[PDB]
Homo-oligomer: 543 residues x 3
């Protein structure tokens, strides 16, 4: 029977049969079932002997610190892992029962409680975020470092599915072709919830966060260090949701970490949502002179050819910036940012294109100077601004087309704004006695319209009569001078004349005449520039 | 060997070895394989003893009524379950071979057949949908109640994957943190296909419909009762497809069910598609005085702070309304609705913002008064209307910006419509001898333009000549009065004058003159309002 | 014990215990583990006896040609399969280290190397793509046909999950309700990477490509032949990514293959991305007289009622066309195409609607005559054009509304272009001394504006003064004739007069006067069309 049993049954060892995880790992052939809670010590390392194992978790890994998995064979899968710390730290909860953010240090300190969730451990970033909190926090609430972390070290082709936990972290160190799939809402600890770190060895490639969600955590939910997806864009974050990150929802590191670059290139950031991060929704910048990366002589600061594939992202409720990035030659599309306390978008980009961007009700707390900032020479095609709630857009070197929304024109600063390809147009006016097409030359004034074409009701509704007026500003008084057609249904044109003797220089073109007033004779005269260019003054109207 | 076998093999019991499902459940340790069809009786209940089981289905559960699963441990998964009724009911199929909807009661009654799919069992909702059908339906086709339902009762953390069936239903009763994942197109029965009902106990939380699709069913495909995802928005429908729901594709219940509220808050509704529902695509309203919920004194009817996260939804072919909802303070984005028989959007919302909405060819059967209705004070930023086919938009209290499409202006009713931030503009005219910029004051007339700026060809194509004309309406005749520049390439301005003696009140501004006709002397006179405001009549032109 | 063991353990056979795959298949009951590499011969066929098996792959299937799986029971799943050829062919790599496409045949021939990846085997399509390459390629690099293919033949309800490979292909022949799920980036061979072919038997239905990605391959990444998803749209490609297809990313075949139709209907193509295909991103056409399909008498060429559900697609970097299709009565939405060498969109459609389309920087290599082409009578609602880089749009029979972007108006050709529903308007000018609203009648001239309304600064910035001017083109000189209001802050209107004796026909309307010059008397005269329609010439101004 043994011969037969050995050939007809599925192989699997279970943790309940061993004293240590390494013993179970050593006995494993195909499957490994975690069927009893396991308390690990920080730094406990397991060697899986290069075996391609299917690890099914039905219990917890309990401990502060890192549980290190090494030598897992390509194709290994770990499903249902649940990490939980032994320590219950002091956490702050910077929001109210009405879901309003608390910005006052004293109010935030008042939220202090010991829990493994529904808040996060304060870190130095909070000292900046809630000024004065550093001196108000009790000593036992400062410098905490609690995270129960599953560290996958130097493995290739390992996937972690439906992971969860309390004060949990997942670290892929020196890994390639690894994925964090369908994270089952783990509640974060002190470190990043999902981290792909490749500071040593080759640049990380094939590393993804696919689907799922995370909650809380003191720093960023998903973060990458020294990863390059190649032209194939093999890596990134797709279909992910981050809620209440103590740092940012999704972050590509910037600058030098250690003696090398922590920057990232050629990754995908698509179909993801970030809600209520304490800092930013998406922080995709690379610069904060670049050991291990391109020299400043090759690419100036904020001008690296990051080449990320960015599309279909939604951000709501950030206490910081909704969407931030830098780089040169980027194509970004379909970004929607709503209800943010700081800027909706902070873009240190150059020679980049932004298509179909919607920034709705941002910088609600005036943390920044604008709702959307673009530093370099960029192109914006389709920009929706203003929801239901300081410049709105400050992109001094950018050319923009297609803005929609109830924006205040005096709060727009761009290099060029134009609608070159509209068809025949109709201006529909509702709730007013007039319809208008206004012109504003920002060089003359950002606050006053310089001229206009209006249509005004004669009499009342259903009168079947209106008058058209063409105006010009004079003496900083909009519509100061104007020509009318059909005022009071008179069916004639009312023409403005120079109130005094017209100077020779008032007339512009040949074969034109300019009426002027001669008070001493109660006459209308006409300064005429003949077809040949010569001036002559004629009598136009008299008693 | 037994000692060794017990430690090296995967544990799993199979249904073929037991007479009842409970016996198999009692013997189960890790896995449970459903390897033979099992006929269950309505109400048959299985107690899984709190065990964390992995149930793999490779056969069917056959029976009318509910098969009840209880006491499954957190982390349990059921994959490949297939529910099928024992009864083959009478179903109607309200659409043609060309996929046209049938709206006539007699034509619908003519479709009657006995089948477990390709149609649905008529219910009272059909009496409203196809008027007169109640009296035309044969008695054996009325009041049927066939559904083979898998009911998961009062469990936490249980996931159902790749479920399917015929006349199938999936009910999560009093569950939390449960998910219906990748539904493998089950064909529905009389009740909802996927239901998260939490009328008793705590409000449902962590309940999701992730991916997959469903077909048919008499009522809604996915529905929620008394669920609240919290600020974390932990719950909802993401990446789902519903086809031909006899009710609505996705529905959050409204009103009182029993003695409590069936309403829902803080859920996500994203990246989903609803096609051909008999009623609505997405019905996300909460109100139809609120036991178990906010009193009317706190929040008036249709003004609850639902706070759902709604984004990236597509609806096509609804016989009812494409997208419907109510609530106050909502942010809704990226909704696309096409080819619907009733309104594309029916919005009983207040103080809400709608960004990038596309309503294309809706209310094709005139079931409603408009294509899009908004009751309260809302903001719409980006609205695409008209495809290739009664008001189009009736949002009396809303402010709108950015409408695109071949809309008839007389069919637009809004509080305010404006394009405040456009750049320099060009009106490009194709197929006509003129280009135009028209003005329409809806208060004066919704059907006639009040004034215009035109450019008209002089001669023909390639003439290099055109004339510009500024017009005004008089006597309900658009363009009745006008000033021209370069008519017939004459290079002069043609000016309209009052056809009779101008009354003193015809002139508006000081330092302006208004030409008028004096027929008795064949002279042109000029009513002049001097710079000082005094009137004087002068002779302008004479023989 | 045997009795007990037989009832408590999971059944699974492993390949290591058998000499052939068929032997393992014959012994299988529930699970089948591929735990050792298996070299198969082309055409090796395995009969699974109708068993519902769960095949877990932890090793490779090695061989050139097809490994054929037949008689798998409904519900069978194959996970982690890895196909690899025995031959290492000669591949070309038509792109540089800077990711620039190589278009020169000699440069492409220079890239030749033997590898199972990072390039593809040349085929006849390359002879067209890189002209002259056919004569430059060495004989050993021509006509190669290496693909290690897993062929699932005539099965129903079989799913392949997390498949991968090198020079790999996956062929579903005569299958229904089958899915290719989460493809783990297999590197393609000579044939299509994922193919659903239903040339024999019933039209394919229920076949999907869900999630995942593929890289390289000589032809199309995902392709369908004779599939019809029905009104339920049961089938298609959702959430998929294709990188560097030697052919197109996603393709529905056109024309006759063998003696029957290879066309497809009622499929879904949503939430997918195609990057860097050698040919097209999405090729969804059906026509290239239709055996096995609709006769030309019923539906003319390019006018089949395909009825696909198309939404939310992104294409970047195609060497060919970004998005192509044909058909009649189609609704297409939310398409984004960026940085393509050939047309962004090539649409042989009629009576179809396109909503929210963005074509950004396409036809960069002038391969086509335009960036977007539409042949038939279609409607486009929302069209974004131009990024940061020959007509732009040529849609002679289409009506368009809502174009945004820095488009050159002379490069637009449409049947009708209009913005019927805009509200009150403001034209904001940045960087210039004037703001303008221009009119262009394309029938008169596609390159010159026919008239304009300008506002120009008087003096300098902060002067609080500007002049408004209304112009008209004459003698092909834009703005040749004009009326001004407030030039040089004179507060009067400058009026142009006919430079010579005005002909009777110059005046258009009754009750209007047209000033004209009489050089011989240094007088301004006025051609007056009296209220009764009679002409009279009067003296207007004199010395």
């Amino acid at each position: 029977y043994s011969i037969e049993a050995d050939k007809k049954f599925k192989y699997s060892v279970k943790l309940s049969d061993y004293p240590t995880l390494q013993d179970a790992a050593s006995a494993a052939v195909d499957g490994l079932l975690i069927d009893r809670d396991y308390n690990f010590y920080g730094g406990e390392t397991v060697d899986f002997g290069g075996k391609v194992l299917t690890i099914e978790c039905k219990a917890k890994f309990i401990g502060d610190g890192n549980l290190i998995f090494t030598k897992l064979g390509k194709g290994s899968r770990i499903a249902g892992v649940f990490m939980e710390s032994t320590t219950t730290p002091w956490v702050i909860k910077p929001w109210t029962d009405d879901n309003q953010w608390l910005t006052d240090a004293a109010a935030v300190v008042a939220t202090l409680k010991q829990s493994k969730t529904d808040g996060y451990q304060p870190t130095v970033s909070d000292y900046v975020k809630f000024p004065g909190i550093e001196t108000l926090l009790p000593p036992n609430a400062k410098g905490q470092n609690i995270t129960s972390t599953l560290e996958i070290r130097e493995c290739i082709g390992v996937e972690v599915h439906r992971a969860s936990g309390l004060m949990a972290g997942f670290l892929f160190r020196g890994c390639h072709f690894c994925k964090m799939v369908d994270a089952n809402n783990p509640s974060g600890g002190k470190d990043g919830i999902i981290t792909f770190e490749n500071l040593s060895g080759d640049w990380g490639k094939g590393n993804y966060v696919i689907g799922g969600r995370t909650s809380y955590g003191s720093v960023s939910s998903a973060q990458f260090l020294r990863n390059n997806g190649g032209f194939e864009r093999d890596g990134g974050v797709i279909g992910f949701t981050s809620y209440r990150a103590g740092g940012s929802g999704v972050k590509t590191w910037q600058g030098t970490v250690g003696s090398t670059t922590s920057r990232n290139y050629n990754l995908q950031f698509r179909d993801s949502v970030v809600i209520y991060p304490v800092w930013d929704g998406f922080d995709l910048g690379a610069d904060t002179d670049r050991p291990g990366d391109y020299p400043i002589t090759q690419y100036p600061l904020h001008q690296l050819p990051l080449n990320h594939l960015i599309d279909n992202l939604l951000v709501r409720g950030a206490l910081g910036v909704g969407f931030g990035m830098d780089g040169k030659g980027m194509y970004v599309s379909n970004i929607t940012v709503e209800d943010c306390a700081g800027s909706g978008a902070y873009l240190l980009t150059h020679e980049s294109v932004f298509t179909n961007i919607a920034i709705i009700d941002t910088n609600t707390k005036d943390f920044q100077a604008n709702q959307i900032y673009i530093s370099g020479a960029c192109r914006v095609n389709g920009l929706r601004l203003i929801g239901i709630r300081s410049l709105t857009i400050d992109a001094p070197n950018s050319t923009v087309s297609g803005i929609t929304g109830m924006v205040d024109p005096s709060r727009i600063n761009v290099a060029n704004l134009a609608e070159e390809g509209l068809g025949n147009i109709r201006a529909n006016s509702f709730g007013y006695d007039s319809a208008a097409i206004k012109l504003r030359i920002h060089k003359l004034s950002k606050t006053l319209d310089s001229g206009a074409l209006y249509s005004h009701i004669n009499g009342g509704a259903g009168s079947g009569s209106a008058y058209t007026q063409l105006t010009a500003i004079s003496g900083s008084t909009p519509d100061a001078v104007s020509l009318k057609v059909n005022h009071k249904d008179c069916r004639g044109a009312e023409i403005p004349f120079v109130p005094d003797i017209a100077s020779d220089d008032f007339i512009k073109d040949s074969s034109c005449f300019l009426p002027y007033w001669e008070n001493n004779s109660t006459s209308l005269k006409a300064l005429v520039k003949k077809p040949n260019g010569e001036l002559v003054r004629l009598t136009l109207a008299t008693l």
